[PDB]
Design a protein around this ligand. Structure first.
Ligand SMILES: [Zn+2]
Ligand SMILES: [Zn+2]
Ligand SMILES: [Zn+2]
Ligand SMILES: [Zn+2]
Lengths: 310, 801
């Protein structure tokens, strides 16, 4: 557990890898985005660029697919999503290495999660804030990546949550190009799987049951070729719910939800859950100060492994 | 019980603290070391007793030691810990609130008296020591009950009555604002933003305010029933809510004496006033129960510790645990950990289990290392890789090498028959006519009886690589012995029935244990005539039961009770070597039963050695699907599948595996290995006729001819338009037509084989996709080493970068 200091003056909120795994982008409450690179010679995380992005605390950033370039989206509490393209003819650690592309001002609420779509669906994007509205933005103009048009606008929640109540919203796409377009959308305590119907509009496809309290993180397991899709869920309870999704009106194919396993090992709130490249290791972080790794041994049932305390 | 953190008194790293016992009798001065989590870090300095009943407490920041203590009887006592004067109002009444400013100015909040002010502000330097009553410089709030007050700066005071919330400046005789609210208790300024303060009410409704909103009026936040009740009825209340002095936009609350909720707030400006909302609440269980009040201890690296006073007056120190906020993985099995407290980020690289060993033994890094080493591009190379560094993978790649050699040499290509990568089950079970299938099977053996199905056994021996001669048997014995594997050679000799040859091979070995095993095996040749049931047979059975080497276990289990069913059912030995004795030393009546049981085992279990039986048929794809479900080894599944999956049939599962492995190769930046995989897919899709079945990458160049304005793609040394014959557009540097090799000159653009390859690579077709101007590759490399503009006249396009 070698630590490296990122250099933020406040709480680091979202850290995300890129596709190649040699770049990390960290956003924090100091209204800054820092991109770090891993040199093959020094083998240490060195800062590439740090620049001020928003007027509030940035809470969600995501990398785009590398076939569309170097694009970083960024969601903050100032109700904006800003897109950042990198021009390589600029100096590192200067603040001008990443150029702004667009501001998505359509959100009437502080945004919580932004996830890019898989590359086979285009240069799409997803938004979710404290107004219950799921917004999809597409880059339909190929000449310039500054005109991102809103395509879909759903309503996950009937009314926005109150000012004094905490809320959490998480997003997860389905990284399979051999299945219809899906989007795992988490409300306060509701988890919804969407589908793109034949009419070109998103429809409610399945609902993951349970979830007695707030959902902190949703992670779709990568489609390695298996016939079942796996969704991991971290709740405000101590529950790490893993759903087994099998796929076979105005939807391309119906799909069923089976709760594969449910674990109470954290005795707290599972703040984040994440998958591996192959979807064989499940990393969960809770309030016990422990990061637990999970694997499936001898069957489909997931069992615990190495526990990392911090 | 009151705990009051004190700043600007200690020049060292220690933080001063002031405490009041729950019986409100004494003032204890503490000194807590922030970097030591032990209970002995709370150092008791001095205790000032002889107080009646303390209702409020305040300290002076400028002068060290000066502590004001109010009381319910009416006497404010100003004294020192690190003089002693009792002062009171003209009319004696309870001091609800007290504030001492930095410039020595002292305010006072009293109860309701109709003939006296409840906010009396005075300086101690102009106080006559001969009288107990104070002479106030500024008096405010007559006929009111000031229950909380706070000094915002050197001149203004933010006072709270029982029905109003005021901000009074001493340079004016009029309050700045008077907002009517019932939440007017325990004003706490935010240390990171003076405009934000925070009161609560009698029902427990906490409210965070903004002074700019009240000046101009709603509270900025409100929490119904968050803190304790009875503010108006009870005068002796424990402050169960503290602002965060470690970071902004955070506060902590005490609930039921057991948990502490750190509410982290978020802000947005509707455009300077920030509208707040609750983002995350973090709950921390207290070390001991029955906690009445608490306060913050700042540590280094944005740490947090909470000094807590229990209901019995015991003061203890409790840390705040480092809770991980995000544990993201990688394509290299690298874990990245982010905390909820500090800034630094922890990383667990790959270089209850250990984390490093569990990430090192996952298949996402095993597949990465194998793809780095070149796994699957040539089956003999895979076998040599595995043998130089999970034994079923070597067996299935050995079978794949044998079958690929059989296909490539035309042993299965010739005839009106495919028979390509077909397993033992498909040959043995039959399936246009029965005589037609018999004669096409016969012509394979007639290229290089004693049984009803004899030619099928010959084809199954050809597929399984078990049609070697006696000289080839001796050559295989020598090859196996040359690797130091004497036990494998003895097992191979016993498998073909040459038990004396196994005795000879294991004789004169390099191990004493092997020589003892050789003597044991040699004690059979004269014993084969016996009926048996000896103690020696029992010794051999026990030795076969206890041995760890599977080949010697095979020998000792076969020598005693010499039947073949005790060898060809265990999973310790390879299925190819099991079929080497099932197709050779067994009869067709039970061979179909054995093949059916083994096929039904390997289809649902998902063993890669079942490809002996199923081949690369659709049943082989089902076996590979079970293997992917069991192990998530999509790399081996894809490399096995591409030998026959587009060539002989078409299914979506193999396309999914190929796309997944290509995406993983892209994610590991192994682009050269991905290209080698693509050319291997294109090479292995050639049918017997020769038609490609692979979905190759489509064309990206459709050059428009300049003379006829038509597509040239609707000549190994010179490319021209097929419609008219006109040459390609000229190079921008040398004005020669592009697309032609062997130019009259040498393009020496910016180990003789690599030099010649570079020279013949310099004369290619290179062009910019922004200005559409063509160049030779060497000409473009030599031009842009000195310039930065397109060489064509009239074009301003920096094609380099
Ligand atoms: Zn032409
Ligand atoms: Zn040229
Ligand atoms: Zn040009
Ligand atoms: Zn150009």
């Amino acid at each position: 557990m070698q630590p490296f200091d990122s250099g933020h003056d406040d709480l680091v909120h979202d850290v995300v890898y890129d596709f190649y795994g040699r770049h990390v982008a960290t956003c924090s409450s100091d209204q800054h985005i820092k991109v770090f690179k891993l040199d093959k010679d020094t083998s240490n995380w060195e800062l590439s660029d740090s620049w001020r992005a928003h007027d509030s605390s940035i809470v969600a950033i995501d990398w785009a697919s590398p076939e569309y370039g170097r694009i970083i989206a960024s969601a903050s509490y100032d109700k904006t999503v800003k897109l950042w393209e990198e021009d390589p003819d600029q100096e590192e650690c200067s603040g001008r290495r990443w150029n702004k592309l667009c501001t998505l001002n359509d959100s009437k609420g502080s945004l919580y999660s932004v996830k890019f779509a898989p590359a086979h669906l285009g240069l799409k994007l997803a938004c979710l804030g404290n107004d219950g509205i799921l917004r999809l933005y597409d880059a339909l103009e190929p000449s310039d990546l500054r005109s991102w048009t809103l395509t879909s606008e759903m309503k996950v929640l009937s009314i926005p949550p109150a000012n004094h109540l905490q809320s959490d919203f998480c997003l997860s796409w389905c990284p399979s190009r051999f299945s219809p377009e899906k989007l795992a959308v988490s409300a306060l305590e509701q988890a919804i799987i969407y589908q793109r119907g034949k009419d070109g509009k998103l429809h409610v496809a399945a609902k993951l049951p349970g979830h007695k309290s707030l959902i902190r993180s949703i992670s779709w397991a990568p489609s390695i070729g298996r016939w079942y899709q796996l969704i991991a869920t971290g709740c405000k309870d101590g529950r790490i719910r893993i759903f087994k999704i099998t796929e076979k009106a105005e939807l391309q194919s119906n799909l069923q939800v089976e709760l594969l396993s449910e674990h109470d090992d954290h005795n707290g709130e599972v703040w984040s859950v994440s998958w591996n490249l192959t979807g064989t290791i499940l990393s969960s972080a809770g309030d016990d100060g422990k990061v637990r790794l999970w694997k499936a041994t001898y069957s489909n049932e997931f069992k615990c492994m190495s526990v990392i305390t911090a | 019980g009151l705990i009051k953190k004190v700043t600007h008194w200690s020049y060292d790293n220690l933080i001063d603290y002031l405490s009041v016992n729950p019986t409100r009798d004494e003032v204890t001065h503490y000194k807590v070391d922030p970097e030591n989590e032990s209970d002995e870090s709370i150092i008791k300095l001095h205790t000032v007793k002889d107080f009646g009943s303390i209702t409020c407490l305040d300290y002076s920041e400028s002068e060290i030691g000066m502590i004001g203590v109010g009381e319910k009887n009416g006497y404010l006592r100003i004294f020192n810990i690190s003089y002693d004067i009792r002062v009171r109002a003209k009319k004696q009444r309870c001091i609800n609130s007290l504030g001492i400013n930095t410039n020595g100015l002292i305010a006072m909040g009293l109860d309701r008296n109709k003939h006296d002010s409840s906010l009396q502000i005075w300086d101690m330097n102009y106080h006559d020591d001969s009288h107990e009553t104070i002479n106030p410089m500024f008096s405010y709030c007559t006929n009111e009950s000031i229950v909380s007050l706070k000094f915002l700066n050197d001149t203004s005071v933010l006072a709270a009555s029982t029905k109003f919330l005021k901000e009074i400046d001493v340079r004016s005789p009029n309050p700045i604002y008077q907002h009517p609210t019932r939440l007017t208790y325990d004003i706490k300024l935010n240390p990171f933003n003076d405009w934000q303060f925070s009161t609560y009410g009698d029902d427990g409704t906490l409210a965070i305010w903004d002074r700019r909103k009240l000046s101009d009026a709603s509270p900025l936040l409100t929490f119904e029933k968050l803190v304790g009740s009875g503010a108006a009825s009870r005068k002796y209340m424990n402050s169960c809510f503290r602002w965060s002095c470690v970071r902004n936009n955070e506060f902590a609350t005490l609930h039921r004496g057991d948990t502490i909720k750190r509410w982290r707030l978020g802000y947005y400006c509707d455009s300077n006033i920030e509208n707040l909302f609750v983002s995350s609440v973090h709950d921390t269980n207290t070390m001991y129960d029955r906690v009445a009040t608490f306060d913050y201890i700042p540590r280094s690296n944005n740490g947090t510790s909470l000094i807590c006073m229990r209901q019995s007056g015991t003061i203890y120190r409790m840390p705040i645990s480092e809770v991980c906020s995000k544990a993201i993985l990688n394509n290299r099995n690298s874990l990245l950990l982010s905390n909820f407290e500090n800034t630094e980020i922890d990383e667990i690289r790959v270089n209850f289990w250990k984390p490093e060993k569990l990430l090192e033994k996952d298949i996402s890094v095993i597949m990465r290392t194998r793809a780095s080493l070149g796994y699957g591009l040539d089956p003999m190379n895979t076998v040599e890789m595995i043998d130089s560094s999970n034994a079923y993978i070597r067996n299935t790649w050995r079978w794949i090498a044998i079958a690929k050699a059989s296909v490539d040499d035309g042993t299965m290509v010739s005839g009106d028959l495919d028979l390509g990568y077909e397993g033992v089950i498909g040959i043995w079970n039959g399936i246009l006519s029965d005589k037609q299938l018999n004669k096409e099977m016969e012509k394979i053996i007639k290229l290089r009886a004693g049984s009803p199905k004899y030619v099928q056994r010959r084809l199954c021996l050809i597929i399984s690589g078990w049609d070697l001669s006696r000289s080839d048997y001796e050559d295989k014995y020598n090859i196996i012995m040359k690797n130091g594997h004497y036990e494998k050679a003895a097992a191979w000799a016993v498998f073909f029935g040459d038990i004396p040859k196994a005795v000879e091979i294991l004789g004169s070995a390099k191990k004493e244990r092997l020589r003892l095993i050789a003597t044991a095996i040699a004690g059979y040749l004269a014993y084969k005539d016996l009926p048996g049931n000896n103690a020696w047979r029992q010794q051999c059975r026990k030795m076969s039961s206890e041995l760890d080497d599977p080949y010697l276990r095979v020998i000792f289990a076969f020598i005693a009770d010499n039947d073949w069913w005790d060898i060809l059912y265990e999973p310790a030995i390879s299925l190819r070597e099991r079929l080497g004795v099932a197709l050779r030393f067994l009869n067709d009546t039970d061979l179909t039963t054995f093949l059916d049981r083994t096929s039904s085992t390997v289809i649902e279990n998902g063993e890669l050695e079942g490809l002996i039986l199923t081949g690369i048929t659709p049943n082989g794809i089902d076996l590979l699907q079970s293997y992917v479900n069991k192990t998530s080894d999509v790399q081996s599944a894809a490399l096995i599948s591409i030998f026959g999956s587009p060539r002989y049939f078409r299914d979506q599962r193999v396309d999914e595996w190929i796309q997944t492995y290509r995406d993983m190769l892209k994610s590991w930046e192994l682009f050269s290995m991905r290209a080698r995989f693509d050319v291997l897919r294109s090479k292995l899709s050639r049918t017997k006729t020769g038609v490609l079945t692979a979905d190759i990458k489509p064309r990206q160049i459709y050059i428009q001819c300049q003379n006829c304005k038509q597509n040239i793609n609707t000549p190994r040394h010179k490319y021209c338009c097929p419609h008219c014959g006109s040459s390609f557009p000229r190079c921008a540097i040398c004005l020669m037509p592009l697309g032609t090799s062997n130019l009259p000159f040498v393009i020496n653009g910016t180990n003789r084989e690599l030099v010649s390859r570079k020279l013949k690579l310099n004369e290619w077709f290179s062009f910019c996709l922004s200005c559409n101007h063509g160049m030779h590759a060497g000409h473009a490399e030599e031009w842009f080493d000195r310039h930065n503009v397109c060489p064509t006249p009239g074009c301003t396009c920096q094609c380099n970068k």
